[PDB]
Write a protein that binds this ligand. Sequence first.
Ligand SMILES: *[C@@H]1O[C@H](CO)[C@@H](O[C@@H]2O[C@H](CO)[C@@H](O)[C@H](O)[C@H]2NC(C)=O)[C@H](O)[C@H]1NC(C)=O
Ligand SMILES: *[C@@H]1O[C@H](CO)[C@@H](O)[C@H](O)[C@H]1NC(C)=O
Ligand SMILES: *[C@@H]1O[C@H](CO)[C@@H](O)[C@H](O)[C@H]1NC(C)=O
Ligand SMILES: *[C@@H]1O[C@H](CO)[C@@H](O)[C@H](O)[C@H]1NC(C)=O
Lengths: 49, 91, 49, 374, 286, 101, 101
Amino acid sequence: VGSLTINEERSEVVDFSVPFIETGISVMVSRSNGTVSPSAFLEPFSACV
Amino acid sequence: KVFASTGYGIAIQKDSGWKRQVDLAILQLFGDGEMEELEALWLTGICHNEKNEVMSSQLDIDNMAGVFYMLGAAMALSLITFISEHLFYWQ
Amino acid sequence: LLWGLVFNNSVPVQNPKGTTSKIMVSVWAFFAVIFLASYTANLAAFMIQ
Amino acid sequence: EEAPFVIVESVDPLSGTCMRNTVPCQKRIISENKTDEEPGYIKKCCKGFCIDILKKISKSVKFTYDLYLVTNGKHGKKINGTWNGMIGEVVMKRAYMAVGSLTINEERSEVVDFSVPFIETGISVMVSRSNGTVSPSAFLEPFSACVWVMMFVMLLIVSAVAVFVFEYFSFTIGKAIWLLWGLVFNNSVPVQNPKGTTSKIMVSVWAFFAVIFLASYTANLAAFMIQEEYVDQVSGLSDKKFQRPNDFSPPFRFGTVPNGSTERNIRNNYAEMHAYMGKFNQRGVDDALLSLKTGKLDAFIYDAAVLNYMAGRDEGCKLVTIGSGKVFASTGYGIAIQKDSGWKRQVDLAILQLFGDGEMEELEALWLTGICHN
Amino acid sequence: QGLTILVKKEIPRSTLDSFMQPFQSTLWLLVGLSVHVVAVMLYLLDRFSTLSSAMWFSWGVLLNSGIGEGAPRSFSARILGMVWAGFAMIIVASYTANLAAFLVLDRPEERITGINDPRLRNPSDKFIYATVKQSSVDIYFRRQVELSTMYRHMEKHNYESAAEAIQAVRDNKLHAFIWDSAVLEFEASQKCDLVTTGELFFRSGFGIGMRKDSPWKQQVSLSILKSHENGFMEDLDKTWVRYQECDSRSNAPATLTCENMAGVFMLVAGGIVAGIFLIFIEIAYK
Amino acid sequence: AGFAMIIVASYTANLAAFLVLDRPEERITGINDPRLRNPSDKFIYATVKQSSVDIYFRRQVELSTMYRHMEKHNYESAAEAIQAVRDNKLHAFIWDSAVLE
Amino acid sequence: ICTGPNDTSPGSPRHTVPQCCYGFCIDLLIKLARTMQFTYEVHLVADGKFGTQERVQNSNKKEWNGMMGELLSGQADMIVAPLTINNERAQYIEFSKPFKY
Ligand SMILES: *[C@@H]1O[C@H](CO)[C@@H](O[C@@H]2O[C@H](CO)[C@@H](O)[C@H](O)[C@H]2NC(C)=O)[C@H](O)[C@H]1NC(C)=O
Ligand SMILES: *[C@@H]1O[C@H](CO)[C@@H](O)[C@H](O)[C@H]1NC(C)=O
Ligand SMILES: *[C@@H]1O[C@H](CO)[C@@H](O)[C@H](O)[C@H]1NC(C)=O
Ligand SMILES: *[C@@H]1O[C@H](CO)[C@@H](O)[C@H](O)[C@H]1NC(C)=O
């Protein structure tokens, strides 16, 4: 027990139970700042005005 | 955005007539919501929130770039107009 | 003139004499104030979400 | 049968069935006079909050019990040196000990005994929620005074500079102040313009100050117009509003409930006010509730915990408690015991034991909570 | 009453002298150039189809005032200046907007906690949180074994008395102290740096303590209960418990007085001094 | 003139306040929302009969007050339920994600 | 192709009309087939309910309506659909590893 991701290569030399919890491959990245649209000024109106 | 998606698990050497028992057991557990409490007791933390907003500032950025572009548009259109006076220098 | 009025009339311009036009341009400027104020409010909106 | 403590309900008509959580709860007295009226055993089953704590106790002190509802009176205000109500049903030794909801107080506390209390409580007030308590001084808010005076002196000094520079470069105070002020204030005003490059530069850069100033100010005002405070109006029974009832307004309406404990308190500290209240009795709770929704009733005075419940469970997520729970006539609920059972001690130590293990967290968080809790 | 926590609050970064705040001074210079840019483009468009004035004209258009009497003589500059003014409005608006955004939206503060904050279930270095030895708090902890990891982790710092603990948290020696309300709240209302936190635990109450059954024990009980109706008890509070208040709330928007506008007030005076000798040299050109 | 400025400012401010601050909305819930622990009239919340959802409920007796209170409305199939909640016949439907989302 | 019922209501012509089925799982099935060398013929279930374990006959027996019924009685031999996992179901059936958490 502990933590063993399931996958093919493993899954034929031993067996496996039913899984606990979702998981998989993902990504982490530091957090930037101020993602304000470069079109902020044109934002608050349609054209019809 | 988990994408290569699977689960954790529990290893068992081949073909122990147990395997079935472990299986039915853990499922039984999922029944009674205990994998709520365990989850909420260890795998949680502060900062759990969807979105927020921070006081950005000091914008020498692509926005004002677009604005200045709308500006220079003026010089463009102006020069376009300019020559038109030459046209009536002939009429 | 009228454009300038809409836009926080920095600009200088000669003024139309005669009560008719006087009234007209005045009420126009009334439109101007509302317009500008609204617009600023909306921009202040977007700069929070 | 008080609302969120001792809920009652009838069995599924199948087989006396109910919902294993509850316990049998017959009110084996049926009120009737035309026939002999042998006390009819109409089995029902109750559940709630108080009940659970009853159950846990009983298990931990190893006894058994049945329940037995009540008929005449509800909480027994004594009358003619006589106790009706459940206090009755325990003083005349027809029923051994009472639970449910009984505020503690002197008059009671000498005819029976009492346990250690569960949960804070007492007398408090409910009142519908107004709107827009924005300060009548909002406009003057976003500045101190020092801004304005610093402005003034800047005015004077720059005006003097206009005098000192305008006379020698290449009609000043009669106007210059006027001009500059106007400039500060979104210069609607018309005014003659100072010719000469010196003053030109000066006034220009001054206006630069102007723009910043105005913009800032507006921002700050927009700030304050987002953090209101909804300061409630009545502020505790000591308020004279609750003392000069017909005097200093179109009079209020101090709804109450008779027969209770609270009433028994009021009529011992402000009999004058009790008089004016007398003509607004609201039987039951929901009566007053609705009457409070629709203007018939102005503000309401009653036990606390029942209110801190009925609040957080009303669709319009606003009713309110007046001072964010300014419980003032303060005591606890409890458990009645007829005099001097050598038990009393056991019950006591038991409930305290319970407070130990935080179960009066879970019970609390399972019943006495609601949405709109903010 | 019951138990709560307390912990030193951090003072908000409401910056006043930050006047140039929303603009990343780079951009300001960008403006300072673009202005003359369009100015010269103007008088150029003038001379072909008023060459020092247009400078005045533009700077006016930006600063809403100070007007000369220039104008467009051409047709081109007409459109030029029109859109120029448009630009101007856009600036000043945007500036206001972002100033507002900064001023109203505060930091996301996380000192807030509860009791189930994991940050108090799995301690680390950075969370020593003691209490008063031999005190009822202790008894509540140890006999709730499910909390044991807390319990033992705290035992290595437990203090001796109130004043000890409070004076401690004044100086960040610890991070969190955990005690009962009708002391902490009075504290946070009198002293002015400390603040309570989320909800309670231990709905207990204080109380007069007797021996085993000295008779008039029973007597005294009655009296207390009476006092809770003549308000006499209720009276004593204002006399002792809720009289001193540091106005205290959420992070409230705060009026500004002079820590900011001085930030440009000074600029004012500067525009003054320069002027004078410019005057001299102006005469020089003369 | 001072007065004038005060007006126009204030007006802008309150327009902003209105435009940005929205209603406090309470449709949001969880699973422990008491409003799903002590039903009333105004909360019928069904599911699909003979469906795994059912099995999860009944065998968790601590939820029984929910369970039985729901049994009197349980529907027949997805389309039934969805087309139902289109028209406020019920208030809340409770099912699995990779269909609802 | 997909042989199914016109079971718009109890008492229908029950005419087992052929229709055509398609989408996600069908795609999955096809991939499996073309990698697993067999043939197949789908057809919708009798009733429409997934399946649970209920006593019937007013005797001591409990059977499954629903899909799993036609899995055990032989009418079928593999279920491909949005079928949940559980406990009871895992008593009488085997489960491949999951394929969408
Ligand atoms: C206490 O509740 C009783 C309800 O039992 C109310 O009292 C009166 O109620 C009795 C009971 O039927 C009637 O016989 C009397 O005619 C009622 N009016 C009187 C006594 O004036 C009332 O809500 C409370 N009791 C009192 C005395 O106000
Ligand atoms: C965001 O701000 C931080 C500090 O406020 C600093 O690292 C830099 O300005 C920005 N960094 C990133 C990664 O966006
Ligand atoms: C009390 O009741 C008795 C009869 O039981 C009656 O004679 C007496 O007048 C009553 N007095 C009061 C004050 O209720
Ligand atoms: C508050 O608003 C409501 C409806 O929005 C209405 O009753 C009235 O305008 C105000 N009432 C009170 C009690 O403030």
